[PDB]
Amino acid sequence: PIQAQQLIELLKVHYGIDIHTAQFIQAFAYQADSESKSYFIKLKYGYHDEINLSIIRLLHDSGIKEIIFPIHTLEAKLFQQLKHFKIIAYPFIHAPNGFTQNLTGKQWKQLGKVLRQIHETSVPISIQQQLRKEIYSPKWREIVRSFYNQIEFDNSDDKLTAAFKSFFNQNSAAIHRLVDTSEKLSKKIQPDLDKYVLCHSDIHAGNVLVGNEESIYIIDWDEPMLAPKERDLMFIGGGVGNVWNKPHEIQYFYEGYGEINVDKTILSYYRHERIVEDIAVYGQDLLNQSRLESFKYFKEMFDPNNVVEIAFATEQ
Ligand SMILES: Nc1ncnc2c1ncn2[C@@H]1O[C@H](COP(=O)(O)O)[C@@H](O)[C@H]1O
Ligand code: NI
């Protein structure tokens, strides 16, 4: 939570960079410009998810360009824990995401090609033991069920808490189905750890910086995992963010992927499941500044042509 001069010194110290500016972008981040090059920094409190930087190494090694690589510290490292802590510099990519920038059909093909490399990238048996495995935890559903009961009129509510409690009832049917379906389809999947692949676990329009020309980047590798490829492929046609829902695009994607057979059941299951999770996530939050957003997003999940519909509409 520091300010320019503070940060400006750390970079000059640990990275050797001579930046004159270090704005802040409302774990924190800033756009620290140099005399010639712009950077994107990440200050993260407490040492966490080191189980991320691995994959970036493994991927950069795999020679996948669509992965923004960190900048080296004088110590020749990718970060600057500085006594347990953590700093991460990245060059600055002036580019909007799929929530702003639409992918040209061509670019879609390229997203197909990189998701495939990633899905075909072998994982060091060692690194494989730190990544999480898809076990179909009935956790999430239990968190949403604990909500059926949690809706009662308690004056000690709030203008915002009421609304959610309301809207949730105003859509109880849909939800139970999402839960009950995410429950039934799990009961049709026979875990096959022999097919699990290195999946980016949340690859929606929000995590693809759609640059110019014909260069794109895939980001946020905080929670990569080993699972049925459909874990990622489900986002193609997903509708997350009220985008990536045009069927004519699902084609451009798989043309850069390859037609490797797709288990429509893991695809359906994962589609209801991610919702249940958000409902359980945005949910448990609305029961302090994100509560305003966690409800705006929560409600969009039910708007025309968004994840909830696409989940119930068998368009696979
Ligand atoms: N290297 C970068 N350059 C510019 N913006 C970035 C960079 N990495 C991440 N971002 C921004 O941060 C948002 C969330 O990404 P993440 O910080 O990886 O969760 C993206 O929507 C981008 O707007
Ligand atoms: Ni490189």
Automatic annotation (TrEMBL):
Transmembrane segments: none annotated. AMP binds at residues 40, 91, 93, 97. InterPro entries: Aminoglycoside_PTrfase, CcrZ_PhaseVar_Mediator, Kinase-like_dom_sf. Mg(2+) binds at residues 207, 220. One of its GO terms (molecular function) is metal ion binding. ADP binds at residues 40, 42, 91, 93, 97. Keywords: Metal-binding, Nucleotide-binding, Transferase. Pfam families: APH. Residues 100-237 form the Aminoglycoside phosphotransferase domain. It comes from the Bacteria. This is Spectinomycin phosphotransferase. It comes from Legionella pneumophila. The lineage of its organism: Bacteria, Pseudomonadati, Pseudomonadota, Gammaproteobacteria, Legionellales. The gene is aph.
